[PDB]
A = this chain, B = another copy of it.
Amino acid sequence: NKLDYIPEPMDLSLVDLPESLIQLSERIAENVHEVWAKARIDEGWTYGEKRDDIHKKHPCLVPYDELPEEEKEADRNTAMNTIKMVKKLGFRIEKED
């Protein structure tokens, strides 16, 4: 092996987010996916049952609801980790009156 890289993510296990926000994690993940998909469809990518760099085919190029549950969980957790980092970095997150 040539490269010796060990990822060390920040410990966000004890960062608490409003329950109201976590209740919306699907809403956030869905929009993240829409942004992702629009960027790939604008580059000529299309849906295909196997990923393919040469023919620009991706299986995840579907509406968010049609994704496998495993893939939605990923998207929801990515979203929550990105926000937990905001809180870890010293910002308050509060639902507006």
Contacts and interface: CB of A to CB of B under 8 A. Distances in A.
Nearest to A84: B31
Contacts of A51: 53
A5 B47 contact: yes
Given A51-B53, A89-B27, A95-B91, A7 B82 contact: no
The A interface is mostly helix, strand or loop, or mixed, namely mixed
Contact of A90 (B31, B35, B96): B96
A10 B31 contact: yes
Contacts of A46: 1
Nearest to A83: B86
Given A5-B62, A7-B37, A31-B81, 8 more contacts: A5-B61, A6-B41, A9-B35, A10-B34, A32-B85, A83-B86, A86-B93, A93-B93
